[PDB]
Ligand binder design. Structure first.
Ligand SMILES: Cc1ccc(S(=O)(=O)O)cc1
Length: 129
């Protein structure tokens, strides 16, 4: 599923992402845009052999199991395919664990290089939340 900006804002808010660990909703919407273009089915293979999955591009090396990543820790205890669903519950629940880790949202390269230090509030402007 390809989410609309406000549509995704509302689903993330409903799932408790607004201000989760101090990160306003705009941060999450901004990260999803630049990580997957709001597409739940997005996949990207990395040079280390791992693959990123879903709306928030969760990595198969540490967070999910895709059956082809050697030394996968599967910290979210879910098959990576579960992260490609039109229902963002699995991705949001795994994202909460990642963000609670240690480096916060810096774990998402797109957030660090394109959202961090910007007016992320603009990502939810006009949305009925
Ligand atoms: C902004 C943007 C556009 C396209 C993709 S893609 O899923 O890797 O093709 C990811 C992020």
């Amino acid at each position: 599923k390809v989410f609309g900006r406000c549509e995704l804002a509302a689903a993330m808010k409903r799932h408790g992402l607004d201000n989760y660990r101090g990160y306003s909703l705009g941060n999450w919407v901004c990260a999803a845009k630049f990580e997957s273009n709001f597409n739940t089915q997005a996949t990207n293979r990395n040079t280390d052999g791992s693959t990123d999955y879903g709306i928030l591009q969760i990595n198969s090396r540490w967070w999910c199991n895709d059956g082809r990543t050697p030394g996968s820790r599967n910290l979210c205890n879910i098959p990576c395919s579960a992260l490609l669903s039109s229902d963002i519950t699995a991705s949001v629940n795994c994202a909460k664990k990642i963000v609670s880790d240690g480096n916060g949202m810096n774990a998402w390269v797109a957030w660090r290089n394109r959202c961090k230090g910007t007016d992320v509030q603009a990502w939810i402007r006009g949305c009925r939340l």
